[PDB]
Point group: D2
Chain length 493, copies 4
């Protein structure tokens, strides 16, 4: 890993519309903080409804029949996505450092995980741009019938702060591969890296108005997108509570199409025949990755009785060894939480765990006197009705639950309004097949956790959301299907 | 001609709530009348299902969907066999069901038999074939993993349908849902409950496990709303008005974030270029608008005609509308039966009044066609302009709007200047005009030299406020599929 | 148990050449006997089709395929309906056809009824569902063009099939060919012509247009060769021996470059790891080899067993083979009927003799089981080694080879050290062993903890000299599809 | 277009195996000629059976389970294809000049058409490498059944001289995208550009043995590949007569899988309502492109009676204007034919046309005293039984036939043992739909000709071959389908 610049310069802090940079109409700004220190990095333009309106107008113009973007060869959309990826790779060291600065995650992880996954996502989707065929369809009668896979049009895309660049890429790849135009609302905690990437979108040669980015708050700019009468589709990643708000805003306005990637309380099931230390280390990763700030987090670790004591002992030792510190130090495993709001809320959940009778095995408090650092925390003897067992914590707080039978753990795993992900650790073919079929989750990992690939789709069951991102499936939400049915003189096979 | 003679007074056998392969009164014991629109007389009372009935239906559907249940364990091919058996039973009872359809809805019996029932049979048979063919994927993910997707059912599917094509809308919903192994709670329209309840009896006869299909007749803001807001319904599919579409999507968001697909209203443009075949275009434009008493969101309700042929097109269209026979729908000479109910009757008369007052030229019809039932004269307005109410709002009756245009660029902009986008058509002999217009129109279906050409193979649904999602075709399965990725660590991935 | 009682002397109704929905003698007026293998007696004479008969059949098929013909114009969904009607007719006549199958081929009636006929019905019904679902594509080519593909039929398809599963091999061929709108000239095996000719009668009854399916019984180097070399056959599909596969592919190349798919021989490995469920593995290994009198290219004819369990596996396998009932195939207690003919009888006895002489341990059987018909004792060889003839060559009879191995790396190399590659299986409780072996084996089907699990949904066919192409599944349509790209200049391409 | 080097240096003239360069075992060589001058460019290693054997052994080793190529991520195969394309683009000016030197086609066309299409083909297929999914299949019973899309293994690929680099790319793109290994036999007339590209395959980082190239003759090296007992699959592009030989060699050996892209006598149908000058110019291109050396050539130009005289007059004027000359001169439209054999054979066909009663309207003779240049030749009043109407000429010899009705022209167009391509020129929707359905051809162009895209498949009906190249379809011939059917405890939907 190239040595980081621990104070990367910030070049882009405004609203991006028609490949130009704007202040907000109000000229208001908001601070973004470095969570390692609690100090302001810079001010950022505070986009609201009137800024969103400009962005939507720009997007709609760029989507007009006969525009450069509408007429461009699909293969050329792919070329432009590949060019974007090459520019990100050129600027990989900078972007990883800026990602760490704004978000808090370790720089080694920003570089080797986030930036790698961004490159792979964009390059994957570049390949789709000229391959998502419609159909020729052997309808009854003397007709030629076929489908066109058109773009849906103006796509509102609202993303969170936990993986700023990667969440941007998961949205832009499929939308652009299929010829949509975008109005993106980046998270107020972490706007900077996506704004830099907008500069690279301009540099790559995307036509103006194809990607517009409005930094600002959720109930102002975000809600303006979800409520807008000329936005055709919204994709939202965030909390389940806000997903409700989005779907109500869509239905209340123009019945735009909605996909949602929401919260989780994902069960990680360790059968007694698992490989012990692999299970312990994967369970540790499953929960603590990215400071616990993952909707995918394995935050109910179900451990079979016969291995429970050993598994717990090992898990506690591993949590106690996990290095919390400055995210630019290569020894650091865990940076701060993103902001003070999250910091306080996680400490609040920890206090609920103690009060409700879970066993605090390690951690439980603040880890530093500056920035938002929380000790890696492990609770044992967790039970299904506890707050920490039910609600998404989004911090470094692990729940270990004991179970006896496979039928029992299916029922407890599934007894959630969430269904984003799950995992099973076992050597047994039959247990793996049974559990992967039975679990009500959009991704089931077997003998692994948090294995993402641009090829394989991701998304929720139940209140974890609707639709899928990544893979071929990621294109469906960005496609408007048009049937053309043509009278012909004489149909033949 | 193969249309068998109808019973004009088909007996009603089924008029209750259908839950777990059982027939029940409403919890309240209330009933509501359904009326024969040809006479205004009550056919029979039907159980008035409400929230408590919907709750029982959802519990029965949930029980049928439990892991390990007969419906969950059944071979996909066997789901196909069940769909084909249901189709056979409907075919057995085709003459009866077509007559019952006409009795309760008002459409001509010949059309109930040759269109509605034929399309029901073809839709169920088409989807039977999908049951064991909607594959998931094996995916060559990076690293030492085997990754694949399972195409699972979503679960408990609430399905709310309108009165315009009672049996066909039932089949568009049941076919993909059942093919993919979902379970159903269906709320049929209060104006047309009877044929769908008969089909429930045939579902039971076919051997579908109890609870797989449940039907709750009742009103919209009671039973329909209870489905849309229910905390244990995983998915809702709604076909109806754009206005109630907004209610459904808000209910979904405000309750449990159930998945939502919508098939809503239209104001579809039918574009006649000056090189069209005139005779063919005139008759197809007539069909496009007047089919099913005008009660189709598909309807070609903005007939755009190029100025060089406009006068002749209008004269020929008026002639044809004057010749269109309004009558008892059991008479095979009848082309147009009554509108479905008194509310619709009055609304359409209201739109006709608006049309006259806002400056459209009334060229024929415009009034009541009979002193009993809900019959309206075929009505043609000429010199219609884009800003008129009758050019913007869906009338849902036998009221035709003819507009004049000059150029292709003009007519693309005018046709697309709507919040609706369900369908469109272009009539032209030219290859290049056909290709350009079919690309340019913002509509979910574009017909070329035809109109109202539906096939179970080809998807249908809206752009813009005409809805979200597609019915029919392979696409119709997407809304009923929950995709699960399974990603397995392996010892050594090889190609 | 739902197996209906058989007629042990089913009447033969159809014994001629089937062309254009007509029954004909051979041009030569020659006939050939088909024999009941249970008794060695002639059932009846069958018309002996040759080149001149094949020429008439091909002309009838070509006429049925002409542009504008009823079969070319027919709706794809209607091709589906015809396939479903044929299935219904076969189901109507299931008891008869299962008995006739057993009479002519020798397999147990219970298996003819519950396996062969069930699978025929499921195959035709599966493919009926594909008829209107094998979409071409709309393709976003560079430039101002609209490009798409049509999935057309190839045309006149020559289909040559063996005697081991007469009706099922007929259905594997007809299902995809007819679903995609091809026409067929089929050459059935001379040992088992009768059931396929009956099914021709049902094809006619179902309403397929004349000439769409034509059947020529006769010999291989006469009628079969005439099909493979014919200048007006567009495609041949052959299932049979690897040796005749080479003849077919050479004939195709030497005549008109017709398209060729082949389903050939096997020497499939069945690998029992030491953590297998022993009782289950023993019974499945027994089935794997002995199913259908050993007459299956699918057969698990190299049973590899890990050394820690080898002795017990062998003792239990011998016990089971000693218990396997050989008898009249109409007796429901019979597990093994006769071999199909005297040539096969002698060949298998020859392989048994080779096995003994080349050092394999004869553990049971090895001889003739009855003094009439072609019955062979279930035969088990232990301590089989890779270089033995009985470990390399396909025996096609009730002769089981058990080999010992130690390691996974070893058994992958040994299993793959064959020019065959049709199927394979692994028995293990471990996830990682199952995944690794399923990736590593060079076989078109790998079964895990099972054997001989066929479904119309899942493709089947060879690696290496076991053949080219796949039957069953969506994949089975590929060989019957001619892809046409249509690329149209348009005024202005938009996304 | 960058100015060409009219004498580019030749770096690579040997057999390429395991990313190394070898003489033939025999140490024999063969000359490759510059067809513009008839002079030898250089000697090339003359590969035969023993060289093929080495190549097949190298390919088989590279395909072993657990090899680098077998274990590489599919996405990484795509990266390597993209890297290959970038290296070709780096060396585009050189490769276009070498292509012209060896083959004869104009340098402007080598640069703007061949090299562009090579880049686009490789970049298209790079995108497929991680997207050609197998299936999960809802079989009856308590089983999990799925397909793996494996590679077929060792793929013999035999290509012609008419589009040397492009034919290489049409073969390598799909084979490598799907993880096969290759033994390629390049045409003896034009070996040089493909050998240079092998050097770029090494430079790109493909593992040794993944691509092996054996220059040499057809009945020696080509036949050795088609007959080889350890080649799993052969793809052959060439003449129909040799396609027969290939299929016989496959059936006579190991029953390898065979696809064939063979000859043509493609009908180009001009209806009376066509746009005249567009039809004339497209018909001219259709026949004369690439010195007539295209199996796709529109070599039966069917012209409706009412436009025949004008169409012919215009076609003759255009042929008389077509500039024959040095292919490095930017004014040159037509270079020489590839070799003396072709030169003589084309002159022989011209003499048959004269003798059988076709009307020679222009050309008909040699166009220069050095190199293999033939005048653009147009025959009128051609009839269906004439040699020039039936047989593939593969030179600048145009056939114009007159017809009256659409039913007549369908029957005459289809009355051929060839079926590679066809076209219709018309304004009429119904005529276009009828003819495109009725014509027995693998590609039907409407109001265009020779419109190729990597997205859209190409290949023959009848004796024009089997299988398709380009598009998703191009992957099918390179995929070995494996069904895995696994007993499970309890199947659920
Ligand atoms: N359908 C298509 O896509 C397509 C494309 C380009 C060219 N073509 C055909 O290209 C041909 C190329 O020129 P050609 O006339 O020299 O073709 P050809 O068939 O003689 O040669 C084609 C290739 O096959 C090799 N070959 C020749 N004899 C062989 C044999 N006995 N065994 C194995 N390989 C052998 C040649 O060396 C060369 O590499 C044209 O005749 C045309 O018919 C077809
Ligand atoms: Na920040
Ligand atoms: Na009614
Ligand atoms: Na027999
Ligand atoms: Na040369």
């Amino acid at each position: 890993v190239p040595a980081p610049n621990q104070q990367p310069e910030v070049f882009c802090n405004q609203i991006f519309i028609n490949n130009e940079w704007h202040d907000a109409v109000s000229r208001k700004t908001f601070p973004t903080v470095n969570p390692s220190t609690g100090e302001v990095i810079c001010q950022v333009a505070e986009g609201d409804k009137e800024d969103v309106d400009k962005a939507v107008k720009a997007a709609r113009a760029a989507f007009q029949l006969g525009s450069p973007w509408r007429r461009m060869d699909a293969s050329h959309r792919g070329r432009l996505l590949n060019r974007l990826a090459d520019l990100i790779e050129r600027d990989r060291t900078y972007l990883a450092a800026l990602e760490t600065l704004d978000n808090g995650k370790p720089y080694v992880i920003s570089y080797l995980v986030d930036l790698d996954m961004v490159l792979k996502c964009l390059r994957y989707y570049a390949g789709w741009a000229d391959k998502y065929h419609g159909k020729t369809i052997p309808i009854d009668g003397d007709f030629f019938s076929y489908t066109r896979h058109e773009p849906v049009g103006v796509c509102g895309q609202i993303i969170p702060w936990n993986f700023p660049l990667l969440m941007q890429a998961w949205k832009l790849g499929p939308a652009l591969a299929t010829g949509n135009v975008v109005v993106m609302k980046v998270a107020e905690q972490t706007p900077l890296t996506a704004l830099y990437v907008a500069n690279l979108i301009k540099e790559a040669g995307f036509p103006p108005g194809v990607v517009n980015i409005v930094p600002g708050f959720g109930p102002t700019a975000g809600a303006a997108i979800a409520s807008h009468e000329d936005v055709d589709k919204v994709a939202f990643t965030g909390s389940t509570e806000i997903g409700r708000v989005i779907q109500v805003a869509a239905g209340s306005s123009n019945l735009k199409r909605v996909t949602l990637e929401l919260g989780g309380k994902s069960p990680n099931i360790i059968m007694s025949d698992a490989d012990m230390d692999w299970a312990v280390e994967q369970a540790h990763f499953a929960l603590f990755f990215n400071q616990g700030q993952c909707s995918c987090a394995g935050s109910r670790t179900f451990v079979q009785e016969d291995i429970y004591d050993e598994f717990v002992e090992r898990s506690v030792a591993r949590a106690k060894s996990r290095v919390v510190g400055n995210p630019f130090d290569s020894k650091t495993e865990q940076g701060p939480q993103v902001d003070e709001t999250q910091f306080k809320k996680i400490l609040g959940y920890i206090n609920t765990g103690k009060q409700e009778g879970a066993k605090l095995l390690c951690g439980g408090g603040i880890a530093a006197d500056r920035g938002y650092f929380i000790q890696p925390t492990v609770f044992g003897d967790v039970q299904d009705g506890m707050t920490i067992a039910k609600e998404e914590i989004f911090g470094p707080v692990m729940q270990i639950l004991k179970f006896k039978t496979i039928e029992e753990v299916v029922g407890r795993a599934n007894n959630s309004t969430y269904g984003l992900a799950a995992a099973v650790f076992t050597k047994d073919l039959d247990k793996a097949n049974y559990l992967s079929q039975a679990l009500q989750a959009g991704t089931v990992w077997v003998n692994c956790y948090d294995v993402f690939g641009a090829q394989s789709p991701f998304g929720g069951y139940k209140m974890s959301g609707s639709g899928r991102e990544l893979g071929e499936y990621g294109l469906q939400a960005y496609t408007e299907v048009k049937t053309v049915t043509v009278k012909v003189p004489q149909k033949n096979s």
